[model samples]
Target: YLDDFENWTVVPVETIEGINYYPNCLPESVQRNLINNVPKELLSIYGSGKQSHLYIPFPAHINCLNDYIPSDFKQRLWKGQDAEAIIMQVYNPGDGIIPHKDLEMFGDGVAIFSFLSNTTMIFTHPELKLKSKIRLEKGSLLLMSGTARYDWFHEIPFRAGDWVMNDGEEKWVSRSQRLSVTMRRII
Candidate 1:
């Protein structure tokens, strides 16, 4: 359910792990719409923010649950009702999110929609000695569920040569703004 900012707090990352991830889940139309509607400034912040990461929320023009979410993932992540959508933007090439699980806010399932350039998103399950690195292609969808959601830890490692030189100084270059629209069940 959409609520006023005064009534809603940022959904912590810890709470996001309980959610599921659906791979290559979004339709071409939805992707096109997002590409068109996403604000340029917001995209810049995501691609270059210096301090804390930023998240911009907008009502999804497309009903992802009804139109884009895959059936296999939906059967497990969606309960009686549909999921709400939110956009997550990250910046700073050298900066990386720590390894953690998304179990604090999203109940038992979460889905991530990745946009922008190509990068490796790593998922690890130490207990099982299992580690998988997924190449998050621009405009692709990634879904993680079951043990992978709660038990596994994921991280985007900080890589150096991934930046571009600007005016003689090496500056982090963003290939087009990484915008991830995550849709999940509210209750």
Candidate 2:
């Protein structure tokens, strides 16, 4: 089963060649280490929001990533091939990304590790007019492949928080600062 990856619970949000979410994939200690290891001064402005990103090149990529990601976990998620390109993003409240598919230059698989706060991502099918919202919690991992990676357009809407149902009531959950580390194979 896909859930057999380590001790983390693998939840398939969309199973048909879709997305897989790993909850609590990284412990709190590692989450802090990851944030601290990132050289924030190197990040460049991404959009007209409180968001920034940094792109790590292929050379010494594994060594740099090793400071944060566990070797076993990296192997399991990336298979044998190491990600040639790594993109890290920091998002403050109200920051969001535009809807888009992974570029054709990247490989089929894309792995994202999230930290700091939970955020919502929206996926839409261009032709079918279908849309879905997925929650990405802190210390979680999200994998997009096949149909979910290629056919769906994903975005993070610009908002200070999200509306969610809790205890039989709908309420607004304010967002906090979030960091996302993404791995992709460049070819």
Candidate 3:
């Protein structure tokens, strides 16, 4: 059954260890463990306000990411392509990233996992001039691919009053400590 948290029509959902995952790719425990622990050295890199760190064991784009890929995806969508790098980010309440694409170095689809607090993601396509806002829940897994990764760029704007509309209601949700882990594959 689909969990009532939020509705995403095209995404595959799964229940595991009492947690519901969208795109139903990874386990809650595995997700939590990786999010909780990262080398202190990894956190040393400071730039782009997102405090991004890359963990690519090797490098490439659009290649196979067979290690930690979705079982269902492997069975049908991707035979062996798995996410190889885990990008860790730490953000404060007002911290937001700029709009940018995944780049030619990374794979097509990207998965972002939210931890510690709920936040918003804004996307805009350069040529199309389209805009979209996404509300990210703690522990929710978000998969961005196809149009979302290639055509459109995703970002979070930093401001004092972060105005967000959720479920047709406008509200102010200050940023707390937020941890975001992005799983990407090198080609």
Candidate 4:
């Protein structure tokens, strides 16, 4: 027997001045299941109209149910019980998020799960004056808590193509759908 699940709704892209907003692109079913199962107190709203954030209260539960995640990875990430899973989806090409620290919201602990696309994420540490980069491969998971989250600011760099190409030499690359599920605790 199969059970019916609620589906995820498409969050419209919010445009304000020159800034653009993007939200998670989860299936209605998945979103419904998450909301229904997770308590209201655990759910915290982040992001704006376009770009939104959904905090999953139980990281362990999501990890157990999600096949893409590894058991060891789950265990390692949830060792301190100070984190939650957050899903972030972005649309529109040449639209990249600005570099900002997650410390203000989640303190210094953040675990990010990259899924559904390939992109380069840049991390900058203002205090240390250091810079690092990571490729968000499909199914790849990253842990950024403690000093890493507070010390570094991360953002997705914009790519030039058909979307926003000043030069005709470069072909535009239509923005593909992308999603990043990050787990962290709020401060």
TM-scores, in order shown? 0.64, 0.75, 0.65, 0.52
The alpha-carbon deviation from the true structure for residue 10 of candidate 4, after best TM-score superposition, in angstroms, is 38
| Candidate 4 structure quality by residue, lDDT tens digits, 1-187 | 0112123221211211111112233344554454355543333333321344556553543543344333444465455453464555543445567787764655544555544455656665454445555555545556554445555567776653223334666444554545556665565
Residue 80 local lDDT, model 3: 55
Error of 4 at 31 (Å): 14
Summarize candidate 1's per-residue lDDT along 37-118 as a digit string, tens digits. Answer: 6555655543453322222343465344345556656775676445654445554455456678875667655666676555
Q: Write the per-residue lDDT of candidate 3 for residues 9-33, one digit (tens) a residue.
A: 2221121111223533445665556
Name the Cα RMSD for model 2.
8.4
Q: For model 4, how big is the CA root-mean-square deviation? A: 14.7
How many backbone overlaps does candidate 1 show?
A: 19
Q: What overall lDDT goes with each candidate model?
A: 0.55, 0.70, 0.58, 0.48
The ten-residue window of minimal lDDT in model 3 covers 11-20
Predicted structure with the largest TM-score when compared to the true one: 2
Model 1: residues >4 Å from true position, as ranges? 1-29, 45-47, 50-66, 160-176
Model 4: per-residue Cα lDDT at residue 26: 37
- Candidate 4 or 1, higher TM-score: 1
lDDT order, best first, reads: 2, 3, 1, 4
**Which scores better on TM-score, 1 or 2?**
2
lDDT of 2 at 115: 80
In model 2, residue pairs whose N, Cα or C atoms come closer than 3 Å (at least 3 residues apart or on different chains), thus clashing, are: none
